[PDB]
Amino acid sequence: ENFQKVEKIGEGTYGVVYKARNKLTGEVVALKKIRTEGVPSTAIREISLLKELNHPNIVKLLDVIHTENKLYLVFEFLHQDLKKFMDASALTGIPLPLIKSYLFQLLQGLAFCHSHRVLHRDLKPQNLLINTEGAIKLADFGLARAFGVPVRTYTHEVVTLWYRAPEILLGCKYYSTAVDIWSLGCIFAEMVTRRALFPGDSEIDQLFRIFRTLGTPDEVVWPGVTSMPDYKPSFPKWARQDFSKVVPPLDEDGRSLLSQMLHYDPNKRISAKAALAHPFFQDVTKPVPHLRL
Ligand SMILES: O=c1c(O)cccc2cc(O)c(O)c(O)c12
């Protein structure tokens, strides 16, 4: 109504995303339309709280619009997402200093969200947005918390499992901030090697891809694992792969940090705050990406 619907910039996890121009402000924004029983009031209040979340590494949520018994989220617009940039960059790779800058910024964003008791739980390259200024920002949180997580995306789209933490796959009902660190670890590896770390095509394939690389978890490395809801004693037992085979040719600082983000036990997994202190970031800078828009 008040927007020009420049274009449809994608099909998001909770619904379609459009680029739109505000006729009033002349502002260009990203408009997300969400799924019809009249909607929960709980989600509206929860999501509305998110407008308050402000940080250079988080995509700004400008407005929540509930009108006509519909739900729209109005976000600040960024021109490119990391998935597109990695594809664009697949021939030459993303330079390490830019990988490092992006990881550092994403951890700052997570540290902020997590200290505010906000989880993403859906992280993936498609929801990490970048600009010409060298910034990267976390988008499209859901919140899967304010909302909930049904079978498909919106209409017949296939959910990506590649970034899902093992505790989610094993049926843990209570997610912690550790799930976001796991996903970001997977994204870090993918920037480095230029292929997804764990590209599972099903929940069990996702789980077994993890096990084949990191070893099948046991009570030694992950106390309580064999009691998890979906754990089966019949899981094959794979040996852990020497870690230098996983993200060559990343240096030992990077491998060390990745290994800490990928710990099986969510309690041992490094926090975003602790990760920012890791020696990998001693030389961090903020390079300009080459973006073709
Ligand atoms: O917030 C966004 C979101 O929540 C979900 C999906 C896609 C997006 C795509 C964009 O280009 C953008 O600027 C965004 O701001 C989002």
Side-chain angles (χ1 to χ4, degrees):
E1 286 101 348
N2 178 40
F3 298 99
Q4 273 72 322
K5 189 186 69 185
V6 180
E7 171 186 343
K8 176 174 175 293
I9 71 201
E11 159 62 43
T13 320
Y14 280 100
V16 180
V17 188
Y18 303 90
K19 184 185 187 176
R21 315 179 177 107
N22 202 321
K23 285 177 188 178
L24 201 69
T25 50
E27 186 184 35
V28 170
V29 298
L31 183 60
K32 185 194 249 279
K33 179 179 62 60
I34 315 280
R35 178 181 304 281
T36 304
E37 294 184 311
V39 121
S41 310
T42 73
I44 287 167
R45 309 166 184 132
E46 194 159 357
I47 291 170
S48 290
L49 275 132
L50 307 188
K51 298 184 212 171
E52 186 182 353
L53 212 52
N54 305 306
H55 186 283
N57 303 115
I58 306 180
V59 176
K60 175 68 177 69
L61 166 61
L62 304 170
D63 270 296
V64 180
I65 299 308
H66 179 25
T67 82
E68 196 271 318
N69 291 275
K70 184 78 283 317
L71 190 67
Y72 297 91
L73 298 183
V74 188
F75 292 102
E76 94 176 274
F77 180 78
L78 282 83
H79 289 261
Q80 191 149 294
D81 66 55
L82 188 62
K83 176 168 177 36
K84 168 151 192 174
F85 186 65
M86 278 190 297
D87 285 344
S89 296
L91 283 194
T92 170
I94 300 169
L96 184 58
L98 185 53
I99 295 179
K100 186 176 297 194
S101 173
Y102 280 172
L103 181 64
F104 190 70
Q105 292 180 62
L106 297 166
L107 287 167
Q108 295 179 247
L110 281 189
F112 180 81
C113 287
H114 295 173
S115 73
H116 285 73
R117 299 134 284 193
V118 171
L119 270 57
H120 193 294
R121 82 189 69 222
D122 209 18
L123 288 173
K124 66 188 137 189
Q126 287 156 298
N127 59 39
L128 307 177
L129 297 182
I130 62 180
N131 65 23
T132 50
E133 300 280 287
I136 187 163
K137 311 189 184 199
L138 300 147
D140 181 43
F141 284 59
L143 275 188
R145 189 175 200 127
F147 295 120
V149 54
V151 46
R152 282 291 180 108
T153 284
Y154 186 82
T155 323
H156 45 262
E157 189 190 0
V158 188
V159 298
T160 192
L161 300 170
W162 297 0
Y163 313 97
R164 293 262 180 272
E167 62 270 31
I168 298 175
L169 298 166
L170 289 177
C172 192
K173 297 179 210 43
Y174 302 93
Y175 300 3
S176 76
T177 56
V179 308
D180 291 339
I181 290 296
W182 176 278
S183 303
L184 182 57
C186 293
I187 294 168
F188 179 21
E190 184 172 344
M191 289 188 281
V192 169
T193 67
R194 295 119 71 175
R195 35 187 317 185
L197 178 57
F198 298 132
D201 74 336
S202 72
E203 286 196 46
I204 197 69
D205 185 54
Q206 185 66 36
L207 192 68
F208 289 179
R209 275 168 185 278
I210 298 169
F211 291 178
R212 284 187 281 263
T213 298
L214 300 177
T216 300
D218 57 20
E219 291 286 334
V220 173
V221 304
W222 190 356
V225 70
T226 64
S227 288
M228 299 258 157
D230 303 327
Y231 176 88
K232 312 291 169 188
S234 57
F235 285 165
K237 298 192 200 306
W238 286 283
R240 179 172 180 95
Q241 290 304 109
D242 168 35
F243 211 85
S244 60
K245 190 182 164 61
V246 185
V247 295
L250 188 65
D251 66 64
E252 177 67 6
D253 281 320
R255 297 190 311 251
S256 170
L257 174 58
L258 184 60
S259 81
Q260 295 192 112
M261 302 178 75
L262 302 179
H263 280 320
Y264 271 122
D265 188 341
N267 297 284
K268 301 187 179 72
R269 203 170 300 149
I270 192 161
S271 70
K273 182 185 176 176
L276 294 160
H278 192 284
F280 184 61
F281 297 114
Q282 185 161 334
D283 67 352
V284 71
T285 60
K286 196 189 179 167
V288 176
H290 166 49
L291 288 194
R292 183 181 63 87
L293 305 168

